[model samples]
Target: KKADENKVKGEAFLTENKNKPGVVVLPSGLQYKVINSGNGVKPGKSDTVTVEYTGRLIDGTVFDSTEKTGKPATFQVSQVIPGWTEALQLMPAGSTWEIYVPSGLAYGPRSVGGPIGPNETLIFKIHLISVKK
Candidate 1:
């Protein structure tokens, strides 16, 4: 019942956010707004890429970030959450986007132990640094 309730709440948030300026909802239900457009290559699912990102809860609690330390994280496209996996292929190197990830595409019924909760919607400001083929 909790998961279902959270789903309803998250979907309602999405419905309202969908009308916000600059926001676009993808087919997978991920919402994103471009902060910077990159002219470089877009990565494939098998490619490894580097990025700078700050993740937060819907209510504005920051759960993770690379901004403070100025370090970029590198990981394979296949190794990330479903929302990231789907969105990254649409992003080119040097691009930045503010992504709204629904719980279904995120941690879902599980919490990773910190600020995140089961079925909690997440927000991330992502900077795509590089794509290594």
Candidate 2:
């Protein structure tokens, strides 16, 4: 319930701005931006996708990303990062987008994976490969 509330708030923030084409609201109050819109195989709310991405902190810190994978990361849209999963479904295949993630949408109020911190905002640039049903 808290996550939903957070997501609602986050969505409101993005909705108010008339700059972006699409907006995603994560349960953690995180929002992502869609930089490049793909048209190969867009994802549904319950589909999976293969993607490549770069994650950074609001302070410009490079934390996590699929660049190290040398390929990309694949997972169910509903099973990945709360923020990411929420956003990917809103995107189509071969589409690239940016997400603004809040700490709650991420690891919540806790530190995670030794890279992210508490209550931090994350910036992600993501490219979607395929949307599997």
Clashes (backbone N, CA, C under 3 Å), per candidate, total 0, 10
| Residue pairs in collision within model 2 | 28-105, 31-100, 32-99, 32-100, 33-98, 33-99, 38-95, 41-93, 42-92, 42-93
Each model's lDDT comes to 0.88, 0.69
TM-score of every model versus the real structure: 0.91, 0.71
Poorest stretch of ten by lDDT in candidate 2 = 2-11
Report the Cα lDDT for candidate 2.
Answer: 0.69
lDDT of 1 at 26: 93
Weakest 10 consecutive residues of candidate 1 by summed lDDT? 109-118
- Model 1: per-residue Cα lDDT over 1-133, one tens digit each: 7666767878888899999999999988999999999998999999999999999876687988998795799989989999899889999899999999998898887744356677888899989999998
Off by over 4 Å in 2: 1-28, 111-113
Which tens-of-lDDT digit does each residue in 1-133 have in candidate 2?
Answer: 5445544654554456425566655555566666877778667778767888888864567887788667888787777768876777677788888888666667765633367655555678988877778
